Amino acid sequence: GEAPNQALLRILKETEFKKIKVLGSGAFGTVYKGLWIPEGEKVKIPVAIKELREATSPKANKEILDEAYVMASVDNPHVCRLLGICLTSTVQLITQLMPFGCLLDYVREHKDNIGSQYLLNWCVQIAKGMNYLEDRRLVHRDLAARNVLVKTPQHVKITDFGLAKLLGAEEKEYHAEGGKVPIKWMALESILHRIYTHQSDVWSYGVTVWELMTFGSKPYDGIPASEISSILEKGERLPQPPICTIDVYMIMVKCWMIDADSRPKFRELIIEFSKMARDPQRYLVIQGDDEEDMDDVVDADEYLIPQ
C-alpha cells in the first residue's frame, strides 16, 4: 500500500564475470564462486553466482526472479547484498561473496575458538538485520542459523529470501497456502494456522540463538516434525544451553511465548544483547574464552632438583 519501490534491478553481462571455482549445489541448482569485473571500472569484486539446473523450469525461474525482487529492495549492513542478475539460459543471481560460508557450519567447525564476544555480537547483528526487515515491512519466514552468512567472523548477514513476503499497508499478517516451511524453527501460530508476522520471525530468532549457543545442535534432534506441534502446545521448549546464564536463556524463552505480542521486538533484542555484549563473560560461561588428561602438569624448566 503506497510508496513506489524505486529499487534498481541491475542486469549484468555474462562476460563481465569469471566463474573460477564451484562452491556447492544443494537442491536449488549450483552456487559458484567468482569475480565480477565491470567494463569501465578497474576493480574486481569477489562474488557468489547462483543459478538453476540446465533444464529450465518456469516456476523455478519465477522463484529466482521473486528472490531478486526482494533482494534488490533491501539495503542494510546485516542483510545480503544483491549485485544483479544475468539473463542467460537460466537467470543467475549474483551476490556478494561471503568467504566463511553459513554460520551454522561455522560454529560447528570452530566450536573450540568461539568466545562469548563473538556469539553475542552475532546476536546483535542478526537482530539489527531483522529489525531492518521489519522497518521495510518484510517477513522472512525462514530465519535460521543456516540462513546467516559470514563475511568475516565479526560481520554476518541474513540471507535466503526464497520465502520472504512483503506486507501491505492495511495488512498485519501473511496467510500462507503451500506447505514446505521448516517446522522446528516456526511459531505455533504458523504450524496451526499458517499465519506469519514479524513476531513469528522472533520465534525463529529464538531458535537461531539457541543453535548458535549450542554450537550448532539440531533442535529437537529426536522428535519428528509431525509431533513438534504437540510438544509445543504442552509447554515443552528447547533446553537451556550449558553456556547460557539464565539472563540469556530468559530471552530465548520469551521469544517462544504462545502470545505473539508478548514476545520481544527486534529493536528490544538489539538493546538487550548490546548490553550483554559489553560484558560477555557475565552472560555466557565458556571454558576457553597433546595427550588429554589432568591439571598437575608442570614443565621441566619449572621442576628443580628434588630427591
Side-chain angles (χ1 to χ4, degrees):
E2 288 64 69
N5 178 188
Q6 306 187 63
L8 265 36
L9 200 239
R10 191 166 195 194
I11 308 303
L12 284 12
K13 295 185 287 292
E14 167 76 273
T15 61
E16 275 182 331
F17 60 90
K18 299 176 175 50
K19 286 193 190 182
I20 293 185
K21 189 186 78 171
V22 60
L23 218 57
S25 284
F28 305 122
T30 307
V31 179
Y32 285 83
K33 170 184 75 169
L35 280 178
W36 177 34
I37 311 167
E39 186 188 77
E41 298 74 77
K42 184 61 190 78
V43 68
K44 294 196 189 165
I45 303 151
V47 134
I49 313 168
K50 172 180 174 177
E51 72 183 317
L52 198 63
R53 201 73 173 303
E54 79 297 287
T56 294
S57 192
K59 50 181 165 182
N61 292 80
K62 181 200 172 167
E63 288 182 340
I64 309 175
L65 269 335
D66 284 328
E67 212 174 316
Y69 176 78
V70 302
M71 293 191 63
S73 322
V74 294
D75 185 21
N76 177 271
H78 304 293
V79 172
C80 210
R81 197 182 191 301
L82 173 74
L83 299 162
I85 59 170
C86 188
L87 295 191
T88 49
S89 309
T90 37
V91 55
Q92 307 181 130
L93 267 175
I94 295 64
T95 61
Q96 168 182 217
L97 180 68
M98 301 303 271
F100 302 86
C102 81
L103 190 55
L104 183 63
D105 295 313
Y106 188 81
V107 293
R108 283 174 180 169
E109 295 298 325
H110 295 88
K111 303 178 185 285
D112 310 299
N113 289 288
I114 296 176
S116 59
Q117 187 69 77
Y118 281 83
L119 291 172
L120 295 175
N121 282 351
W122 291 333
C123 286
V124 176
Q125 293 176 38
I126 296 167
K128 283 187 175 174
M130 292 306 283
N131 176 66
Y132 171 85
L133 295 182
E134 178 166 345
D135 276 344
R136 286 283 281 90
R137 292 185 298 200
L138 186 54
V139 177
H140 195 285
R141 306 180 61 239
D142 197 15
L143 176 51
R146 82 190 107 82
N147 291 336
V148 172
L149 304 184
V150 183
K151 168 176 156 63
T152 70
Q154 39 273 128
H155 189 169
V156 303
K157 298 188 185 196
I158 304 167
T159 199
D160 208 290
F161 294 92
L163 288 80
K165 294 303 167 71
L166 282 173
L167 299 186
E170 311 296 281
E171 192 167 23
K172 70 177 193 304
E173 56 182 79
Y174 172 76
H175 296 251
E177 200 63 41
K180 58 180 180 179
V181 191
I183 294 189
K184 293 172 172 181
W185 279 260
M186 42 204 291
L188 186 69
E189 79 233 56
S190 300
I191 298 177
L192 272 296
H193 307 77
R194 298 177 186 160
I195 295 184
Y196 291 87
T197 62
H198 298 315
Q199 290 310 103
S200 169
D201 272 345
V202 168
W203 182 297
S204 312
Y205 177 84
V207 181
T208 305
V209 167
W210 184 91
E211 288 185 84
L212 301 182
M213 257 20 128
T214 59
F215 300 96
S217 292
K218 309 166 61 179
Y220 320 102
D221 196 21
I223 311 297
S226 60
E227 198 180 306
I228 299 293
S229 169
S230 302
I231 80 179
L232 296 182
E233 294 194 281
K234 296 181 185 307
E236 180 167 352
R237 294 294 189 279
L238 291 176
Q240 178 168 358
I243 65 159
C244 289
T245 54
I246 190 183
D247 295 84
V248 173
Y249 182 61
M250 202 85 247
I251 305 279
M252 289 178 228
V253 165
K254 290 177 181 173
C255 292
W256 304 332
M257 296 214 65
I258 276 87
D259 197 43
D261 299 314
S262 275
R263 315 178 186 146
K265 296 179 190 302
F266 285 116
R267 64 170 304 275
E268 288 158 1
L269 277 333
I270 300 183
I271 293 161
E272 296 314 294
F273 283 103
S274 277
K275 290 178 183 164
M276 294 181 176
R278 284 174 173 266
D279 198 15
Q281 297 193 300
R282 183 181 171 181
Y283 303 104
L284 291 174
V285 187
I286 299 169
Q287 295 181 245
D289 245 314
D290 325 302
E291 63 289 323
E292 302 166 20
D293 220 285
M294 211 168 84
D295 63 11
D296 276 292
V297 56
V298 167
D299 185 270
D301 293 321
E302 282 73 60
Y303 187 64
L304 303 165
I305 313 179
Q307 180 67 342

